[PDB]
């Protein structure tokens with residue numbers, strides 16, 4: 157570690173702790189920068205030489221983390237918990253927590269190599285059929301899951317991906333879990349999952365989540381039964397069991413996590429205007445550039461910041477056309493130099509991708525708003541806040557009235573049929589996700605705690621997938637398969653519960669900004685576009701970073717200091733009642749009592 161980057165001396169008391177924290181943050185900025193740059197270089201251009209450089213940057217970050225961490229523990233371990241200043245308790249508390257820097261050198265290198273190899277496997281995995289031709293997840297497999305209605309073709313894509321990504325990840329993921337736990341246990345956590353959960357500073361986190369899910373589950377059950385009936389009408393009594401789980405490949409998405417793509421099959425009133433504007437975007441010839449500019453302009457309408465020149469010059473907004481492998485999974489980047497901020501997204505011209513652009517731009521806007529704070533306060537109030545920002549705007553954007561304003565929809569009527577179509581569409585996107593958003597880290601917490609050893613990785617994954625989502629694998633799986641590994645966030649070792657928290661929080665935010673905007677109608681028809689008052693209220697959250705506990709930031713914004721499902725329920729209320737009525741009238745069974753049921757294979761599986 158460079159002498160400039162090493163800690164000096166400070167007194168062993170709170171006042172010395174303050175100078176320590178100030179000096180730590182000054183040096184951390186340069187270390188953060190080299191790490192992010194090295195990651196960018198790799199993720200936008202996956203090569204062996206780029207991975208090596210990224211691993212060297214990771215090692216440097218660990219050197220830094222060890223030097224300052226050991227210093228924190230040397231001076232403040234017996235006393236920091238009694239420090240009068242809570243903001244200081246949080247920083248010294250962080251710095252004493254070394255993570256992977258607790259590992260000896262050989263194991264650090266092992267750890268960094270594992271993260272690189274898992275990332276490469278997920279992002280370069282292919283499904284091969286000409287016999288030489290192979291499909292990538294993004295865009296090829298994504299498009300198949302989205303627009304193919306051929307049971308056998310969907311199965312080929314689903315099975316191919318899960319096998320390609322999952323099988324070779326398993327041995328690496330076991331090794332990562334052991335090293336991760338080894339590292340965090342030295343910091344005093346029972347396991348890595350306990351550390352991840354501690355970011356929410358709620359002694360009652362898991363219980364709070366379970367109570368939230370209990371209120372939401374009836375909405376999911378009804379949507380599920382309605383959707384399963386729509387699928388049965390298309391795929392027949394052979395492939396769909398009206399009392400069983402839905403086969404996992406028929407919902408529009410590789411993970412059955414958003415059901416927006418099957419909207420045309422489920423839309424209650426097909427003779428109203430088509431609220432999926434994808435085909436209009438194609439007909440009008442929208443490109444990635446347009447999508448990003450349209451998203452930016454919503455942000456500036458609120459008097460939030462435009463994207464800076466560095467963003468437009470540095471960002472990767474389409475999958476490269478040259479012979480280059482990249483991580484296509486979308487992300488938003490802060491380089492920690494208060495100047496460079498970028499999105500990396502393999503943008504496709506679709507309505508859901510337009511919402512995705514807003515999502516990533518929400519992350520950037522957060523970065524732009526808190527860029528002048530001490531480096532340790534450059535985070536969301538909690539990670540769920542960071543995930544909610546862009547989704548909040550996308551809720552206004554997808555309203556039929558807003559789509560009309562941006563030329564994507566001829567004026568729609570204020571009628572009850574159109575409302576049900578819209579709310580059903582929004583349910584496929586938002587309600588359908590909830591079980592998945594909840595289950596992923598239940599699975600991962602069980603793995604980190606040891607309740608789920610490698611011998612039960614897949615058994616427990618599918619237990620959870622069936623329990624919450626009411627889906628089943630369309631082919632037989634066993635413990636050689638590692639289906640959790642075929643989801644980005646697992647091999648990329650980044651937490652998922654933030655998204656469940658985001659989905660509740662975004663409706664709380666939406667309700668608060670709509671009220672602030674002076675809007676008076678139904679919550680699902682609110683468009684905060686051009687509301688500088690809504691913008692000012694959002695800006696206060698963004699500029700706070702993590703300087704204040706999230707419960708207080710939420711209280712100031714929303715009037716409540718806790719996550720609350722009521723705003724989401726309020727938003728969906730009309731379609732919640734409608735689906736319940738329809739399911740009853742149709743004589744549906746809610747849930748999937750035939751829990752053991754799996755679909756048969758197509759007659760000519762796997763060729764076609």
Ligand SMILES: O=C(N[C@@H](Cc1ccccc1)P(=O)(O)C[C@@H](Cc1cc(-c2ccccc2)no1)C(=O)N[C@@H](Cc1ccc(O)cc1)C(=O)O)OCc1ccccc1
Pocket residue numbers: 485486487488489508511512515516519535536539542543547550589648650655
């Ligand atoms: O860039 C990220 N995180 C990206 C993931 C990531 C994490 C670590 C390392 C590399 C990458 P993402 O969540 O933007 C990447 C986004 C991509 C995305 C968004 C949408 C979308 C669809 C419709 C409407 C709105 C959004 N569909 O895919 C993501 O994964 N989302 C989750 C879950 C999800 C989130 C929102 C949502 O609306 C739907 C789903 C997923 O795809 O599984 O982190 C920024 C940040 C977060 C928290 C604190 C600080 C910084």
Ligand SMILES: *[C@@H]1O[C@H](CO[C@@H]2O[C@@H](C)[C@@H](O)[C@@H](O)[C@@H]2O)[C@@H](O[C@@H]2O[C@H](CO)[C@@H](O[C@@H]3O[C@H](CO)[C@@H](O)[C@H](O)[C@@H]3O)[C@H](O)[C@H]2NC(C)=O)[C@H](O)[C@H]1NC(C)=O
Pocket residue numbers: 557570571676677678681
């Ligand atoms: C789409 O249509 C709805 C429904 O509008 C209502 O019912 C129709 C059948 C007609 O009779 C309409 O004339 C009638 O308003 C609209 O919802 C309504 O919006 C209005 C205007 O913002 C709301 O009026 C306000 O009500 C609050 C009370 O909460 C007062 O404080 C205000 O002074 C103001 O009068 C009205 O409450 C609201 N109705 C309901 C049931 O929520 C909706 O605005 C419209 N949407 C669009 C985008 O055009």
Ligand SMILES: *[C@@H]1O[C@H](CO)[C@@H](O[C@@H]2O[C@H](CO)[C@@H](O)[C@H](O)[C@H]2NC(C)=O)[C@H](O)[C@H]1NC(C)=O
Pocket residue numbers: 201203204205206480
């Ligand atoms: C992808 O990364 C590689 C490095 O892995 C880059 O290749 C280097 O490019 C510079 C200048 O173009 C050369 O001086 C080096 O000799 C190259 N290194 C190697 C190992 O070949 C490459 O430029 C990157 N590609 C893109 C499009 O950015």
Ligand SMILES: *[C@@H]1O[C@H](CO[C@@H]2O[C@@H](C)[C@@H](O)[C@@H](O)[C@@H]2O)[C@@H](O)[C@H](O)[C@H]1NC(C)=O
Pocket residue numbers: 632633634635636637
């Ligand atoms: C697990 O399954 C592997 C491959 O899947 C199998 O082959 C396909 C075509 C179907 O027939 C499916 O039912 C089978 O599961 C097997 O090759 C492998 O032997 C199995 N692993 C273990 C440990 O038994």
Ligand SMILES: [Cl-]
Pocket residue numbers: 355539540651652653654
């Ligand atoms: Cl999280």
Ligand SMILES: [Zn+2]
Pocket residue numbers: 515516519542543
């Ligand atoms: Zn995100």
